């Protein structure tokens, strides 16, 4: 039949449809559960914060990421595709990951603040670093700690910048990305990140 | 050594950050204030990173010394051991208050700290600072592993620091309130 495990996943998955309307909240969780036929009474089983829905989404995105990278690795192994240089590969990996945000971009800044709260942080940081380990695994060649920290910082800063980016198809974000990736490959857009941080400052202060 | 003189230029440049920011301009002024030519700034990066990093390590060092003073007060019987949450709220407030004279330029400094080539150093200063606060907090009072304590306190600190950049309240009252809430959050999870 269906485990409780499978049921919750199903609800969270269906709640994503309503995020663009109710945001990352227990409200959207309810509309999800209801679109599945579940009573509003039965729809109560997740924290009013929307954090489980956010974490759900993130892991689903990382799962989607792992699938893409495994497959492109499969082409290399099949001589069907030419291995990319690390710097190029990370830019493609990160872009690929951040484009999954676009359909939800409207409320993503609030979701990010919630990820940053103390009670969500061990979980979200754990997803982040697992994701970063995957990108590095599929890249293929700095010690583990410097690689992990540099890619996570490239990811988060580019993420913040994207939140303020309104150039066509996010040209500016991908530009920022390339600049950061080259900054990391060599070891040494500035203002763009301070508006990013101010944006994040503002969202945090609004709760 | 050449290390000392640089340390001394960097410390002297701090005086000029309020006016010139985390820039070579600051460093040149600093050098000039020690009766050196502005050309001695040539011996540092134009980034601002070395000056910022210098400042951060000085604040962390000064924090350790303050926490050492409070601990000795307790061991004298002149104060009572504070609860973890109260201790963490005080320690974070003490650390962020050092930012105040520099606050106009701190958002740029944060963005520089976050560059990939500053990150190893940046994160390293931050982990030492958090380990240190927990040390003086007394790990005896907590049911979290090293990882949770570290991640939660770093987050409390970074979020409070961000929020402080937007705070126009008198004496950052709103920042301390946010900080209290974040610490309540960590104590409760
Ligand atoms: C900008 C974003 C930067 C992210 C840094 C990720 C690096 C992680 C790492 O390098 O280490 C992570 C190990 C886990 O290590 P584990 O694999 O044993 O689990 O936790 C640590 O000690 C460091 C504790 C995490 C500190 C994070 C500071 C950011 C708080 C923002 C709010």
XYZ file of C-alpha atoms and ligand atoms in Angstrom:
428
model
C 0.000 0.000 0.000
C 1.634 3.185 1.271
C 3.989 3.802 4.201
C 3.696 7.007 6.225
C 7.067 7.794 4.653
C 5.650 7.650 1.137
C 2.536 9.606 2.152
C 4.354 12.641 3.458
C 6.555 12.728 0.388
C 3.430 12.708 -1.756
C 1.922 15.648 0.170
C 5.123 17.721 0.141
C 5.525 17.034 -3.574
C 1.962 18.210 -4.254
C 2.417 21.238 -1.958
C 5.169 22.527 -4.263
C 2.446 23.337 -6.800
C 0.906 25.780 -4.376
C 4.105 27.438 -3.204
C 4.010 30.048 -5.977
C 0.680 31.050 -4.436
C 0.958 30.552 -0.666
C 4.752 30.590 -0.424
C 6.934 28.207 1.601
C 4.411 27.763 4.383
C 2.149 25.339 6.235
C -0.564 26.965 4.117
C 0.843 25.465 0.957
C 1.294 22.125 2.791
C -2.437 22.152 3.495
C -3.492 22.923 -0.067
C -1.194 20.124 -1.183
C -2.743 17.589 1.175
C -6.199 18.721 0.098
C -5.487 18.481 -3.624
C -4.800 14.828 -2.842
C -8.267 14.384 -1.365
C -7.055 14.670 2.224
C -9.230 16.471 4.753
C -7.995 19.792 6.144
C -8.011 18.008 9.500
C -5.713 15.295 8.131
C -3.632 18.032 6.491
C -2.012 18.888 9.845
C 1.242 16.960 10.197
C 3.965 19.476 9.320
C 5.428 22.521 11.086
C 3.673 25.849 10.479
C 7.097 27.145 9.370
C 7.239 25.390 5.996
C 10.791 24.226 6.698
C 10.126 20.522 6.066
C 8.628 21.546 2.727
C 11.715 23.607 1.987
C 14.101 20.823 2.976
C 12.003 18.387 0.928
C 12.452 20.609 -2.114
C 16.192 20.977 -1.605
C 16.863 17.252 -1.348
C 14.651 16.646 -4.369
C 16.762 19.208 -6.266
C 20.006 17.569 -5.152
C 18.575 14.182 -6.109
C 17.732 15.620 -9.514
C 21.294 17.003 -9.717
C 22.922 13.671 -8.908
C 20.909 12.090 -11.717
C 22.034 14.645 -14.292
C 25.708 14.350 -13.376
C 25.701 10.537 -13.284
C 24.255 10.550 -16.794
C 26.783 13.001 -18.244
C 29.455 10.862 -16.606
C 27.895 7.896 -18.409
C 28.445 9.631 -21.766
C 32.116 10.269 -21.025
C 32.517 6.589 -20.158
C 30.798 5.725 -23.455
C 33.189 7.883 -25.472
C 30.043 9.744 -26.541
C 31.119 12.946 -24.780
C 34.412 14.725 -24.105
C 35.427 15.185 -20.457
C 35.109 18.828 -19.398
C 37.777 20.789 -17.538
C 37.026 21.171 -13.825
C 36.338 24.900 -14.002
C 33.922 24.408 -16.863
C 32.282 21.423 -15.158
C 31.585 23.275 -11.890
C 29.998 26.197 -13.771
C 27.697 23.804 -15.587
C 26.910 21.930 -12.354
C 26.074 25.079 -10.391
C 24.067 26.681 -13.181
C 22.155 23.417 -13.602
C 21.408 23.415 -9.883
C 20.285 27.068 -9.659
C 17.979 26.906 -12.681
C 15.796 24.499 -10.700
C 15.093 27.483 -8.445
C 13.573 29.644 -11.176
C 9.982 28.389 -11.054
C 10.046 29.131 -7.312
C 12.238 32.175 -7.366
C 9.552 34.564 -6.092
C 9.554 33.198 -2.553
C 13.014 31.655 -2.536
C 14.550 34.595 -0.587
C 12.234 33.799 2.337
C 12.988 30.066 2.059
C 16.695 30.914 2.281
C 16.240 32.857 5.514
C 14.429 29.909 7.014
C 17.225 27.559 5.997
C 19.544 29.874 7.936
C 17.685 29.598 11.224
C 19.512 27.667 13.997
C 17.053 24.748 14.061
C 17.206 24.188 10.294
C 20.896 24.863 9.886
C 22.326 21.443 10.723
C 20.021 19.903 8.118
C 20.445 22.507 5.384
C 24.194 22.713 5.821
C 24.287 18.927 5.562
C 22.402 18.985 2.254
C 24.692 21.741 0.991
C 27.898 19.866 1.710
C 26.531 16.571 0.403
C 25.599 18.395 -2.764
C 29.087 19.982 -2.972
C 30.731 16.577 -2.453
C 28.724 15.211 -5.381
C 29.717 17.979 -7.758
C 33.370 17.373 -6.819
C 33.003 13.617 -7.195
C 31.803 13.958 -10.776
C 34.331 16.653 -11.578
C 37.410 14.469 -10.974
C 40.992 15.498 -10.148
C 43.201 21.683 -2.790
C 42.401 19.269 0.029
C 38.872 18.067 0.615
C 38.087 20.909 3.053
C 39.214 23.772 0.842
C 37.359 22.322 -2.121
C 34.180 21.832 -0.129
C 34.307 25.338 1.361
C 35.176 27.070 -1.873
C 32.407 25.406 -3.919
C 29.812 25.943 -1.152
C 30.770 29.624 -1.007
C 30.590 29.867 -4.788
C 27.191 28.238 -4.630
C 25.725 30.430 -1.880
C 27.052 33.757 -3.101
C 25.893 33.016 -6.667
C 22.561 32.045 -5.129
C 22.264 35.386 -3.302
C 23.229 37.283 -6.442
C 20.592 35.468 -8.506
C 17.938 36.687 -6.076
C 18.597 40.249 -7.259
C 19.323 39.446 -10.894
C 16.881 40.581 -13.581
C 19.104 40.432 -16.665
C 17.716 38.175 -19.437
C 18.050 34.461 -18.616
C 20.130 35.548 -15.576
C 23.194 36.455 -17.661
C 24.554 38.446 -14.709
C 24.290 35.509 -12.311
C 26.159 33.157 -14.654
C 28.736 35.882 -15.176
C 29.190 36.254 -11.427
C 29.476 32.440 -11.295
C 32.250 32.312 -13.889
C 34.160 35.048 -12.071
C 33.880 33.188 -8.772
C 34.863 29.847 -10.318
C 37.972 31.447 -11.839
C 38.705 33.135 -8.512
C 38.770 29.640 -6.995
C 40.816 27.932 -9.719
C 43.561 30.563 -9.422
C 43.267 31.507 -5.746
C 42.851 35.256 -6.269
C 30.947 41.416 -9.322
C 32.020 42.606 -5.863
C 29.204 45.119 -5.458
C 26.740 42.553 -6.845
C 27.373 40.379 -3.792
C 26.894 43.224 -1.312
C 23.419 43.830 -2.751
C 22.942 40.084 -2.454
C 23.859 40.200 1.248
C 21.738 43.266 1.854
C 18.878 41.401 0.204
C 19.476 38.537 2.622
C 19.813 40.968 5.528
C 16.391 42.396 4.618
C 14.681 39.020 4.341
C 16.069 37.859 7.711
C 14.945 41.007 9.481
C 11.386 40.454 8.173
C 10.813 37.679 10.757
C 61.056 41.222 11.043
C 59.007 42.384 8.046
C 56.024 40.583 9.571
C 55.857 42.974 12.551
C 56.045 46.199 10.551
C 53.186 44.896 8.374
C 51.187 44.006 11.465
C 51.856 47.587 12.613
C 50.841 49.174 9.313
C 47.635 47.092 9.275
C 46.750 48.097 12.830
C 47.469 51.712 11.993
C 45.346 51.522 8.856
C 42.303 50.511 10.932
C 42.131 54.127 12.100
C 41.428 55.180 8.524
C 38.835 52.572 7.503
C 35.905 54.675 8.734
C 36.937 57.368 6.188
C 38.612 55.315 3.398
C 37.118 51.838 3.761
C 38.897 48.465 3.509
C 41.176 49.728 0.827
C 44.782 50.444 -0.061
C 43.903 54.085 0.657
C 43.408 53.110 4.284
C 46.719 51.253 4.314
C 48.639 54.135 2.745
C 47.212 56.518 5.354
C 48.233 54.029 7.991
C 51.758 53.818 6.646
C 51.947 57.627 6.429
C 50.827 57.815 10.050
C 53.860 55.769 11.064
C 55.985 58.200 9.070
C 56.286 55.955 6.037
C 55.656 56.794 2.385
C 52.285 55.754 0.944
C 54.416 53.467 -1.242
C 54.715 50.998 1.652
C 51.111 50.002 0.879
C 52.562 48.478 -2.279
C 53.664 45.727 0.134
C 50.049 44.583 0.568
C 47.245 43.618 -1.785
C 44.911 46.221 -3.277
C 42.044 43.930 -2.325
C 41.427 44.987 1.265
C 41.398 41.336 2.286
C 44.555 41.426 4.422
C 43.342 44.423 6.403
C 39.907 42.863 6.943
C 41.395 39.545 7.895
C 43.783 41.349 10.257
C 40.859 43.132 11.909
C 38.834 39.915 12.275
C 41.703 38.054 13.959
C 42.264 41.022 16.309
C 38.543 41.044 17.281
C 38.567 37.300 17.903
C 41.664 37.686 20.075
C 40.134 40.546 22.004
C 36.928 38.473 22.466
C 38.919 35.551 23.930
C 40.498 37.962 26.394
C 37.104 39.358 27.413
C 35.652 35.891 27.927
C 38.742 35.033 29.972
C 38.024 38.077 32.199
C 34.416 37.134 32.727
C 35.389 33.562 33.610
C 37.876 34.749 36.225
C 35.244 37.053 37.729
C 33.062 33.984 38.208
C 35.942 32.006 39.762
C 36.531 34.865 42.190
C 32.922 34.614 43.322
C 32.335 38.134 42.016
C 29.725 37.048 39.458
C 27.522 33.995 39.039
C 27.808 31.500 36.201
C 25.410 32.576 33.497
C 23.144 30.144 31.721
C 24.276 29.009 28.275
C 21.644 31.044 26.447
C 22.479 34.194 28.409
C 26.159 33.543 27.932
C 25.817 33.090 24.190
C 23.704 36.229 23.884
C 26.340 38.230 25.737
C 29.271 36.766 23.866
C 27.735 37.384 20.442
C 26.794 40.969 21.472
C 30.345 41.675 22.688
C 31.805 40.381 19.415
C 29.453 42.289 17.086
C 29.791 45.557 19.046
C 33.390 45.684 17.870
C 31.990 46.175 14.351
C 30.260 49.433 15.181
C 32.951 52.030 14.285
C 33.370 50.243 10.915
C 29.775 49.423 10.186
C 29.361 51.620 7.095
C 32.012 49.512 5.350
C 31.273 46.134 6.909
C 28.823 44.889 4.241
C 31.555 45.257 1.644
C 33.984 43.499 4.021
C 31.590 40.576 4.419
C 31.312 40.264 0.653
C 35.103 40.141 0.417
C 35.342 37.600 3.237
C 33.051 35.452 1.094
C 35.231 35.369 -2.009
C 36.564 31.834 -2.763
C 40.208 32.794 -2.074
C 39.321 34.363 1.289
C 36.946 31.601 2.307
C 39.459 29.129 3.839
C 40.832 31.881 6.097
C 37.421 33.439 6.705
C 35.746 30.192 7.721
C 38.743 29.270 9.800
C 38.615 32.458 11.843
C 34.889 31.853 12.257
C 35.175 28.232 13.445
C 37.871 29.151 15.996
C 35.695 31.991 17.301
C 32.664 29.718 17.708
C 34.704 26.860 19.302
C 36.061 29.472 21.670
C 32.655 30.812 22.720
C 31.461 27.253 23.386
C 34.613 26.604 25.416
C 33.863 29.518 27.723
C 30.166 28.656 27.663
C 30.877 25.347 29.399
C 30.017 22.405 27.140
C 28.783 20.679 30.310
C 25.534 22.552 29.700
C 24.382 21.213 26.316
C 23.027 18.067 24.630
C 24.400 18.829 21.167
C 27.350 17.324 19.356
C 30.318 19.414 18.226
C 28.711 19.712 14.801
C 25.321 21.052 15.845
C 26.878 23.489 18.350
C 29.256 24.746 15.738
C 26.743 25.110 12.916
C 24.043 26.638 15.125
C 26.318 29.177 16.774
C 27.933 30.197 13.416
C 24.414 30.712 12.016
C 23.196 32.702 15.001
C 26.308 34.854 14.563
C 26.118 35.324 10.783
C 22.387 36.034 10.725
C 22.637 38.550 13.580
C 25.560 40.238 11.837
C 23.525 40.529 8.595
C 20.503 41.890 10.370
C 22.688 44.401 12.196
C 23.686 45.956 8.818
C 20.057 47.064 8.356
C 19.431 48.140 11.919
C 18.612 51.804 12.507
C 17.266 51.196 16.023
C 18.907 53.050 18.925
C 21.992 51.120 20.030
C 21.054 48.166 17.772
C 18.248 47.201 20.156
C 16.507 45.334 17.276
C 19.697 43.355 16.559
C 19.952 42.113 20.173
C 16.280 41.189 20.125
C 16.793 39.180 16.941
C 19.832 37.564 18.605
C 17.845 36.579 21.686
C 15.253 34.945 19.419
C 17.863 33.031 17.436
C 19.473 31.792 20.660
C 16.019 30.774 21.955
C 15.616 28.873 18.679
C 18.878 26.976 19.174
C 18.210 26.163 22.799
C 14.754 24.784 21.856
C 15.424 22.602 18.839
C 28.912 30.539 2.695
C 28.719 29.263 3.002
C 29.705 28.545 3.542
C 29.541 27.260 3.867
C 30.692 26.490 4.485
C 30.521 24.988 4.268
C 31.762 24.222 4.679
C 31.632 23.150 5.464
C 32.794 22.338 5.903
O 33.868 22.397 5.325
O 32.668 21.421 7.025
C 31.399 21.258 7.654
C 31.572 20.447 8.931
C 30.784 19.154 8.781
O 31.683 18.083 8.507
P 31.163 16.556 8.410
O 31.467 16.190 6.981
O 31.984 15.809 9.436
O 29.689 16.622 8.736
O 31.057 21.181 10.043
C 32.005 22.158 10.565
O 32.953 21.792 11.241
C 31.810 23.626 10.271
C 30.478 24.095 10.847
C 29.695 24.836 9.779
C 29.991 26.328 9.753
C 29.124 26.977 8.674
C 29.137 28.499 8.735
C 28.006 29.077 7.890
C 26.780 29.511 8.693
C 25.876 30.340 7.784
C 24.524 30.653 8.400
